[PDB]
Structures are given as structure tokens and as C-alpha cells.
Ligand SMILES: CC(=O)N[C@@H]1[C@@H](O)[C@H](O[C@@H]2O[C@H](CO)[C@@H](O[C@H]3O[C@H](CO)[C@@H](O[C@@H]4O[C@H](CO)[C@@H](OC5O[C@H](CO)[C@@H](O[C@@H]6O[C@H](CO)[C@@H](O)[C@H](O)[C@H]6NC(C)=O)[C@H](O)[C@H]5NC(C)=O)[C@H](O)[C@H]4NC(C)=O)[C@H](O)[C@H]3NC(C)=O)[C@H](O)[C@H]2NC(C)=O)[C@@H](CO)O[C@H]1O
């Protein structure tokens with residue numbers, strides 16, 4: 571089984587214990603570690619943070635301890651505009667320029683592959699996404715002739731049905747990608763005023779609409795569209811999504827006034843790192859959706875939908891039972907990487923719980 575783990579560039583800037591450097595990563599925890607995110611300047615792959623070359627170097631030294639470890643650099647991300655990806659992929663000339671700049675960059679910094687995070691391709695983009703993937707793969711095969719191990723090519727894909735039908739030719743890109751990470755955790759649309767879980771495993775027998783918004787449907791659908799199970803990787807969040815309640819009602823369908831207040835270290839309305847959630851739990855009321863199989867908590871006017879060791883182990887067993895290629899974790903820096911916030915003196919409790927399940931066959 572594969573254990574794909576993301577590390578974010580900006581996590582280095584968090585205060586105190588929140589600060590996380592590649593250096594804090596257990597070399598034997600994951601099979602693949604993806605650095606997020608690379609940028610695109612003058613139609614060429616480029617660094618993002620001022621100290622990326624230094625951090626790139628720090629992350630890739632981990633392979634001195636675990637020779638089997640594979641690293642990839644991810645391009646795109648949610649802060650990188652989709653229009654930019656769209657513009658580059660639409661013109662064969664700007665697309666070929668981008669493609670050619672990649673292998674040399676990956677080789678200079680010691681990466682074993684490239685991860686595509688175009689979020690997201692629209693109706694007019696579908697055909698070009700396919701061309702981009704296909705041509706990028708062809709360049710990697712051509713570059714391997716130089717005698718060095720062929721670079722890997724992956725992509726992070728939306729788990730929402732409408733998004734899938736709109737911009738992806740799954741059957742086509744599946745044959746060129748080494749693996750596909752399903753983003754099965756942004757299911758509760760940032761649009762409306764209700765409380766809900768962002769990463770439920772199952773539908774939840776007490777609802778009619780949006781049967782599409784849960785990991786199980788997304789996986790089944792991808793398999794139905796043509797994606798082979800041995801190339802599919804299921805995303806498991808290491809963060810939670812918070813809400814500020816508009817009333818004293820704390821259960822399903824309860825009214826929402828907006829995102830939950832920022833975390834002390836994460837400082838971003840709407841989300842909390844798992845290590846922040848562990849602190850938040852003290853004095854909170856914990857509940858669990860039996861049907862969906864995921865937990866949530868409340869304290870004051872704050873409502874949090876998250877994943878714990880149990881929900882995460884549960885998702886890992888599901889993935890195995892369906893014979894998928896493995897799991898993807900977003901993100902190492904949001905897990906209790908120091909092992910000092912969540913009780914158990916265990917480092918990376920969430921990612922470890924997944925690994926343990928994956929290891930038992
Ligand atoms: C919110 C929403 O609606 N979007 C949903 C998506 O999240 C989701 O996408 C997939 O799933 C995850 C999680 O859901 C996505 O989110 C992540 O990806 C985004 C990046 O593309 C993250 O955005 C960033 O936010 C951070 C924190 O606020 C940004 O902040 C900072 O970065 C700057 C610039 O680099 C730092 O600068 C430095 O500051 C120092 C002093 O201030 C200087 O000394 C230093 O020199 C200076 N700059 C230099 C030189 O570099 C700031 O310090 C730093 N911090 C602050 C002030 O807070 C970060 O830059 C943003 N990212 C980018 C690329 O711009 C987002 O936060 C993150 N979320 C989480 C929870 O981690 C992923 O994008 C995506 N996952 C994958 C696989 O790619 C989708 C569903 O998939 O749903 C969307 O609705």
C-alpha cells in the first residue's frame with residue numbers, strides 16, 4: 571500500500587510549536603512525501619517561498635535515512651489561480667514550454683516526481699488537462715532514456731461529482747498518471763449556512779440530497795468512470811473544519827452564522843490543525859455520526875467537524891477492502907507532528923494510525 575503525505579511550505583511560518591520544517595518528518599512514516607506548492611513563472615516551474623531551495627534540500631536529505639522514500643513536488647494549489655493553469659494548458663506552445671522545464675528542475679533539487687494540483691479544471695479545460703497529462707508523461711518517459719529512474723506523475727483530483735463530470739476525462743488521464751489522489755474531504759460546500767461534516771465516509775441514512783458528498787460515493791464513481799483501483803489513493807484530512815453556531819442548536823442541520831474562529835497557531839478562520847483540535851477538546855462535547863462514521867465537537871458557539879484515530883483507521887480499512895492503491899494525507903504539518911498536544915506521546919498520531927492499518931494486510 572502507498573502512504574502519500576503532503577508537507578506545506580507555509581507551515582514554517584507558524585509561531586512556537588506550530589512551526590514545522592521538513593526536518594520534523596519521520597523518514598519511515600510515509601512512502602511518498604509531496605512538497606506544496608511550486609509556482610509557475612514565464613511558463614516554467616519555479617520556487618515559491620524565498621527559502622524553498624533550502625527546504626527542498628532538507629526534505630530530500632530524509633532519503634539518506636530511508637532510501638525507499640520518494641518525494642514529489644506539487645504544482646498549483648488553492649492559492650494559485652485556476653485561470654493560470656488554464657491559460658498555460660490551452661496553448662500547445664506555452665504547455666510544451668512548461669513541460670520541458672519540469673524534468674531539469676526536479677533533477678536539480680532531487681525530486682522523484684511531479685504532482686499536479688490544478689483546482690479546478692472547468693468544462694473548457696477538460697480536453698487540455700488530458701493533453702497536459704499525456705504530454706507531461708511522454709516527456710518523463712523520454713527523459714528516463716538518460717539512464718536515471720523515470721520521474722513519477724500524479725494529480726490531486728476533486729472528489730465532488732459535479733466537479734468530476736465537468737472537468738476530468740478520468741478514463742484518459744488514469745492511463746498516464748502513476749497515482750491519483752482523491753480529495754475526499756472538502757465535501758461540505760463553503761456556500762451555505764448549515765452545520766455538516768466535510769469528510770464523511772458514508773452517506774448517512776438520514777438525508778436525501780447530496781448522496782454524492784461522501785468518500786464512498788466518490789470512490790465508487792471513480793471506479794465506474796474507468797480509474798483502476800491500483801492507481802486510486804483516498805485522501806484523509808488531518809485538519810478539521812470549524813463553524814460559529816447561530817443558535818444553541820448543536821445537531822444535524824443546525825444554523826450557522828459563519829466560519830469558526832481562528833486557531834492559535836493556524837490563524838485561519840474555518841480550519842483547525844489536529845493538534846489544535848486536541849487542545850480544543852478539553853471542555854468540549856464530543857459526538858459521532860454513526861452513519862457517516864466521523865466525529866464532531868462543540869464548545870460555546872464553536873462547532874468542529876474532524877477526524878480522530880478511529881475515523882481515520884476506519885477510512886483506512888475501507889480503502890483496503892476496496893483494494894485501492896493506498897491513502898493520501900493532508901497534511902503532515904497539521905497532524906500532531908511534535909507529539910506534544912494530543913496526550914499519547916506518539917508523534918504523528920493520525921498518520922501513524924493510518925499506517926498501522928495499512929501495514930496489517
Ligand atoms: C478555503 C477554501 O475554500 N479552499 C478549499 C481548499 O482548501 C481545498 O483544496 C485542497 O485541500 C486543502 C485543504 O482544504 C487546500 O488548502 C490549502 O492550500 C492553500 C494553498 O494553495 C492554502 O492557502 C494558504 O493559506 C496560508 C495560511 O493563511 C497562506 O499563508 C502564508 O503564506 C505567505 C506567503 O508564502 C507567508 O509569507 C511570509 O511571511 C513572513 C512574514 O509575514 C515573511 O518573512 C516571508 O518572507 C513571507 N513570504 C515569503 C518570502 O515567502 C505567510 O507568512 C503565511 N501565513 C499567514 C500570514 O497566515 C498560504 O500562502 C496560502 N497558500 C498559497 C499557495 O497561497 C490553504 O491555507 C491550505 N488549507 C489548509 C487547511 O491547509 C489545498 O489547496 C488543496 N490540497 C491539495 C491536495 O492541493 C479544496 C478541495 O480540495 O476546497 C476549497 O474550497
Ligand SMILES: *[C@@H]1O[C@H](CO)[C@@H](O[C@H]2O[C@H](CO)[C@@H](O[C@@H]3O[C@H](CO)[C@@H](O[C@H]4O[C@H](CO)[C@@H](O[C@@H]5O[C@H](CO)[C@@H](O)[C@H](O)[C@@H]5O)[C@H](O)[C@@H]4O)[C@H](O)[C@@H]3O)[C@H](O)[C@H]2NC(C)=O)[C@H](O)[C@H]1NC(C)=O
Nearest residue numbers: 608609610611612613614615616617618619620649650654
Ligand atoms: C508565481 O509566478 C507568478 C507568475 O510569474 C508571479 O507573478 C508576479 O510577478 C511580478 C513580480 O511580483 C509582478 O509584476 C507586475 O506585473 C503587473 C502585471 O499584472 C504589471 O502591471 C500591473 O500594474 C499596472 C498598474 O501599475 C496595471 O495597469 C496597467 O497600467 C499601464 C500604465 O501604467 C497600462 O498601460 C496597462 O494597460 C494597464 O492598465 C496592469 O493591469 C497590471 O496589473 C507591473 O508593472 C509589474 O510588472 C506581477 O504582478 C505578477 N504577475 C502577475 C500577477 O500577472 C508571482 O510573483 C509568483 N508567486 C510567488 C509567491 O513567487
